[PDB]
Design a protein around this ligand. Structure first.
Ligand SMILES: CCOc1ccccc1
Ligand SMILES: CCOc1ccccc1
Ligand SMILES: CCOc1ccccc1
Ligand code: FES
Ligand code: FES
Ligand code: FES
Ligand SMILES: [Fe+3]
Ligand SMILES: [Fe+3]
Ligand SMILES: [Fe+3]
Lengths: 446, 192, 192, 446, 192, 446
């Protein structure tokens, strides 16, 4: 397939070829043009707070070690020995000043440097240039309010610029709330779906909620429960959708601070969020204080998703075109009482974790939609994302980005896939930029 | 068991061994086997309401954890060691049961097929609470659906059972430390 | 069990539960365990003639079905719900045993290896036929052949056993509703 | 591999490269040139008799919904939602006026039309053109005496013409017997063989019976039992072989009406078939009445096989080059007593079903022959099908098609693979026709 | 069992059947079940030293073989039929236990997870040695490590157990003929 | 990938691209340029000593039947029927005058000839040319002191020449000891590693022993036990490394006759080897008699490895780029007492068999190093094998080949990978020879 020419996503992001969820050659191409190029979630300050603390993370199909340095910075390195290529670290988290390879015993510092080689003097003499044998380092590592992302491509925009218009929506919860903590360890489950299936669902799919999650809505008694079985449509002005230049987007459901949490948490949460909102009105204004306690379903392009307020935090780690390893953490506000943090974390896992009953409603949807992308008569078929097209705006006085002023639509699908196509057809960041110079105009046509 | 000598053994595991090596009550092992076999039968036929009514105590904690992989020699890193795949009280189990039985649970059509294999049953009365029965058992759980989906789960269960309404012994605690860190079964949406 | 409340439970399954929840005869559960363990041993060592002679009644129906996947809410479509993978009388079992033992059964060289795991044994005498023993049990059946072929079968068995020649309890009915709709084991050429 | 030029099947179908059973690129090519082009078995009238009745079926690796319309016709559609591509129907059979997708709740009629979209007015307004969003329909659906076949290619010959000379042999049992019913549901088992391995075996392999099925012949006491362990060769005139332009073929074993059925059914069947034959003599003549009660081992190209009289009906559903999902139904004559129909169906499954003891004899043969096609030293080796070559005829006064007047030979292998090669090297039906203009001459050389 | 009639049965297997079909001592089957369940518990929690001290006799032979695939009709080729995956005396088991417990056994970090399922327990006293207990049982052994590595082992075990120090019954022989010829579990580094 | 041009192994064998352990296209290319071209281990005289004795073996991914002929020679044939390609022999060893196919009953002699075809006269008449239908024969089969190797390429050098300078080191144990026997049957286990990972480890990796096998060294009490946890380096002159033109190489650890065997065998072995060495001094000289009782870790290129004295004999049978089927035999000296042979064989399996505790130490090393070769950021990375480079010699007065006069180094990695690269980039033996005309000069640079 010629990725320079092949139209995988149609103009304005209105449709995508179904093969994108199934084609292994394209998956391999995405390793280069999506995963080696873009910002990927690694960890949170809260999981590696002290010098020497480390975790392992995936970046695409690669594994990295992410380590807190003595100077308080964070550096990340391929989890691969520079000698004969053995996996260096076999655990998920810990604290160490270095990592010794179990094959021939080479010792690397937390800073990636090759520090020791067994019997170096007797074997190598002075001939081994250890200075050139440090672990392969992730070129870019940056923080968004404690959330640590990595990028293999030195040419990427800074993380803040990459978030584009999405940052404005995230800031009330990520910054102005006093800050978030990530509660680990994550649940980890393999699903038989393409990474794009859950990514697209979290970025912009409010339409599916009443029908897909009918049983969870009815059974759980959460605040969005009126939607069960499409019994009721959210009122006008119940929310909005947004998307951005580099592909990140989200839905906003106004005031939905207790999110998917069952009635057992609703009163406490609605009290807590409302009390903080009252304080934030004076700081960031009424609209942004309201956004703080509004439910955001967001994907940070390409494969990191979240539900704010619900507190669900996801990584869709790619394995192959029909296999994804799902990591699920809980996010909590730092100034919540500890007992509430604990119950919130359990509730995140209860609803969206490995045995998350909400998450289970989505399984067949993502898996079959992905696997059908391999089927002969469907490869060249068109997946539709045209809902709300021709009613999006850009440059609004209040809400930034390409915005659909309705709770349910496909605005964020369009922006996600526009960015995806621009990357797949480009060899580097400069070409992506050229392919994106009229990004918002393309999205707001008609 | 001396865990300073048996270096691979956790304090918790050594404590649980001690519980069963002492008094052996053969009649109790038999009662426990019956209890667990009947529980597994109710679950296998998806009689989830009957399971709640007959097998689950009002004060239940039903807990399945997933433990983060850490170095055997780790001694400094002290953050949350595990997450809860399940950590349910009775009402939370009831929510999950209603979710299973809801006619708009699309994933349950066509009907799933469950087969449970319970082995290695051990039972001992608590020392201090003469009405508290400790039961340990292992489960293989086979779930089949939709023609060619097959998921097999494996776990050890540390249970506490106590006589409740009508003198019926009911589950008041189940603890499972799930042995596979990354699930390869699509989800853990089964009652172990 | 009220199947109007426990919406996922079939009438048949609810009837079978009732059978075992009533009288519990511990000695009978033990007898049934012995019977099934010895049967599984004979099968595992491929003593198929001995199995027929010692374990199988002349009036046997040996039945394994595969049920078509239908909507949970289906109420109109009423054609044959299942096919018979097995539905054998004694002579038909004998044919299958002769096929296994034939020296020109090329598939049996090199010799197959079978390992059976029988669990969850329950037993109850029939109410009306005081000589009819109902036995329920689950089986994991591991079949290995030709270096790297491994097939694992999982099933629940609803049996009836009755005393025959010499007072020996023998199988007069086995019913299995096989849980996987599409077999991923090359065939179902094993005696569950 | 260049399929225009590569000789995968030699002249006259005398041999085939072993790689055809193992090569995944060729498997993918077959999806286009074999499965998307030819007629494939779907279901029988007897399984969807009433309006609203439906089943799912495979066509190649694609899945379709096959539905009885209100007007009594049958239409078939890809089992894939036109929105985001989720699998629409998750059951195997049922009755419904429509199918609702569990993802976003789009509702399609039994006629494939998009009939309802949740909250369409509020979300899409008048902008959704539902008329262009019907399920992707199978272009051609036709019946042969109740047996329903589908074809994705509008350019295919009518099913009757496609059956070619094979139809004449099938008609006494399929038509003149008063008609057949298919007894469902089918057994379903995955084998590790290429779909062509069982297809070729059923189309033309009488040679294997005495040796492969030695144990089943000896143990079961069926009428063909004298063959066990090659103890005896069928007498001269015991049968014949035939093949046809579009690849379908069969063996004919004269008078073998009880087929593979054990002695427990032999007297009843031999009585029943003989009684009907006596009536048919007056209608269709002695030869065709005899064909009615003669055992036919047939493959309807590419992947539907059957044993008439035995009542075995097979679909070899392709998964990959070394994986096939085998569907097994029973066929019975409509005017048989119900109790006999029931016993015949059980006997079909007993012999050739998931635990079919006859079918089990074939497993290692098909699986290893297929898997060896991947092995380096065997890929370019030649599978032989030359038995009886130079003794076939065409245009016989009594028996139509390319015919070998002997019970055991490889006539039907040659016709099967001639048609296979003509399809693989052609881009469309017109090219197949051009490549087949001298089909019978090629088969009867020497 | 007549092995001239039951053509698929080996002389060894026929001899082992005979052992259990005769005297049935129900109390002995129960004792054996307890013994094997406790042994499996110690192994599952990786209390390998405790296993040696409590479960393994000083005179033990612990043997697991892999048998070469030969024709069912083979009668001429008479070279070594099997190799020993294990054939250990007590000291050799101790070596393996020390290897497991060594802090530089890198493969044991992060800690492995074991779950054993013991079924089909049969027990009979030896005829001639009134202190020798024959125990047969089947094991499914689940080993999970490093996030997504899962290996499942299946075997039948022919044991001899004898009372040793303190009157404690200990393993003096275990024989396993491993059913899979080519292992698909990375290794057989588990105590069956 | 263009194998004529792509530098997979750098000059002097100093490094290799990590992708060589993971790339499936290269694996397929190796089937042609490595496995179909080079000498591969089949069996030993001791396993097929009498006429009619046979075993099955892999050669690459192909399976062959290896049979003792009536004249005492050995011939090997593809285990594939010449009719429709079924696997002929399903057992691992036996004795027979021929092999009959279970599909249609064709009978082949132990000499590969098609001897019988069921009902040939009635079916084929005189038309079947059985003389052209013999099993596909392995072109070259030769013995090295009872050890039988095969090669599909008629153009290969004789086995003795192919062993090159390695033969000199093997001869004291293989020839002058009175001869070895192979004790079967082998253990067989699948590992998730590339075949090259264990091959490279056995050919030249003494460096890993103290660290990788720290626990086995400490627990087992073998003679090399001082190395546990890199507690001690072997003294100067403790051994050497060698490599050869066609890729075979080994390490030599002086005097280590009891090898990895636990203390229970050490005294007996050290007595036995020393006693034979005393006799051999007079025959082959002191140096070669010492080599006899010195531990050799050797790979016979490409995928046969051994530890002499330890008695470990390995075949790394390739399945795919990350899958290898490991066969493990024991080698014993023929004139050892039978009871010692038995205990030695058990000890080989105890340490390096399916439950070999030493072998288990290597698992994660080989598996992760191989699997990392598929990871995007590692494919183009360089595996290092530069230890000892610039200190190797060729043409030494005492020790032949390219030799590093030190116990620990990467000399043998360099020679292995030099030969590997020359094969991968060549279309035939003549091109390999051209690419190897300065092989030792390339290895001894600087
Ligand atoms: C979009 C993924 O799931 C959601 C979305 C919105 C609200 C609640 C859950
Ligand atoms: C050809 C597949 O099987 C057959 C063929 C002919 C007769 C009976 C069975
Ligand atoms: C090289 C593979 O293993 C070895 C090597 C040298 C000595 C002992 C074991
Ligand atoms: S591979 Fe890491 S030290 Fe050699
Ligand atoms: S995928 Fe079917 S309604 Fe959206
Ligand atoms: S495939 Fe071997 S005889 Fe036909
Ligand atoms: Fe959802
Ligand atoms: Fe057949
Ligand atoms: Fe090693």
């Amino acid at each position: 397939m010629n990725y320079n020419n092949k139209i995988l996503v149609s103009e304005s992001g209105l449709s995508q070829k179904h093969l994108i969820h199934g084609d292994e050659e394209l998956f391999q191409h995405e390793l280069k043009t999506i995963f080696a190029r873009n910002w990927l979630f690694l960890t949170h300050d809260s999981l590696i707070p002290a010098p020497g603390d480390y975790v392992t993370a995936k970046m695409g199909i690669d594994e990295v070690i992410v380590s807190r340095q003595n100077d308080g910075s964070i550096r990340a390195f391929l989890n691969v020995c520079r000698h004969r290529g053995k996996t260096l670290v076999s655990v998920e988290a810990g604290n160490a000043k270095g990592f010794v390879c179990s094959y021939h015993g080479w010792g690397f510092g937390s800073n990636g440097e090759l520090q020791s080689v067994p019997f170096e003097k007797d074997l190598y003499g002075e001939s081994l240039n250890k200075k050139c044998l440090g672990l392969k380092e992730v070129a870019r590592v940056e923080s968004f309010h404690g959330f640590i992302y990595g990028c293999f491509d030195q040419e990427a925009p800074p993380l803040m610029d990459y978030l584009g218009d999405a940052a404005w929506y995230l800031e009330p919860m990520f910054k102005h709330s006093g800050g978030l903590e990530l509660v680990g360890p994550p649940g980890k489950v393999v699903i038989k779906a393409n990474w794009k299936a859950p990514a697209e669902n979290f970025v912009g799919d409010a339409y599916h909620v009443g029908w897909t999650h009918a049983s969870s809505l009815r059974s759980g008694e959460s605040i969005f429960s009126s939607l069960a079985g499409n019994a009721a449509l959210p009122p006008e002005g119940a929310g909005l959708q947004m998307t951005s230049k580099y592909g990140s987007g989200m839905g906003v459901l106004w005031d939905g601070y207790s999110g998917v949490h069952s009635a057992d948490l609703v009163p406490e949460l609605m009290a807590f969020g409302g009390a903080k909102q009252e304080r934030l009105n004076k700081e960031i204004g009424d609209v942004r204080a309201r956004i703080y306690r509004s439910h955001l379903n967001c994907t940070v392009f390409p494969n990191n998703s979240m539900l704010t307020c619900s507190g669900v935090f996801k990584v869709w780690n790619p394995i192959d075109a029909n296999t994804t390893e799902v990591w699920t953490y809980a996010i909590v506000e730092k100034d919540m009482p500890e007992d509430l943090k604990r119950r919130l974390a359990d509730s995140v896992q209860r609803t969206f974790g490995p045995a998350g009953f909400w998450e289970s409603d989505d399984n067949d949807n993502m898996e079959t939609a992905s696997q059908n992308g391999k089927k002969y008569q469907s490869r060249d078929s068109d997946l539709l994302s045209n809902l709300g097209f021709g009613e999006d705006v850009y440059g609004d006085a209040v809400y930034p980005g390409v915005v659909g002023k309705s709770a349910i639509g496909e605005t964020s699908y369009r922006g996600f896939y526009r960015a995806y196509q621009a990357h797949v057809s480009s060899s580097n960041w400069a070409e992506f930029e050229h392919a994106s110079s009229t990004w918002h105009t393309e999205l707001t046509k008609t | 068991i001396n865990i300073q000598e048996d270096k691979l053994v956790s304090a918790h595991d050594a404590e649980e061994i001690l519980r069963f090596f002492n008094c052996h009550d053969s009649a109790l092992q038999q009662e426990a086997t019956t209890l667990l076999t009947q529980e597994a039968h109710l679950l296998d036929i998806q009689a989830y309401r009957a399971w709640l009514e007959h097998c689950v105590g009002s004060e239940v904690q039903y807990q399945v954890i997933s433990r983060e992989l850490r170095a055997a020699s780790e001694r400094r890193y002290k953050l949350n060691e595990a997450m809860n795949v399940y950590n349910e009280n009775f009402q939370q189990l009831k929510v999950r049961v209603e979710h299973q039985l809801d006619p708009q649970n699309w994933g349950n059509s066509p009907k799933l097929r469950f087969t449970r294999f319970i082995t290695n049953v051990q039972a001992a009365m608590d020392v201090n609470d003469k009405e508290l029965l400790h039961i340990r058992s292992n489960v293989i759980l086979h779930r089949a659906r939709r023609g060619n989906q097959v998921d097999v789960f494996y776990a050890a269960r540390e249970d506490k059972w106590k006589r409740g309404e009508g003198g019926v012994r009911k589950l008041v605690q189940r603890f499972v430390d799930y042995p596979e860190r990354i699930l390869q079964t699509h989800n853990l949406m089964v009652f172990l």
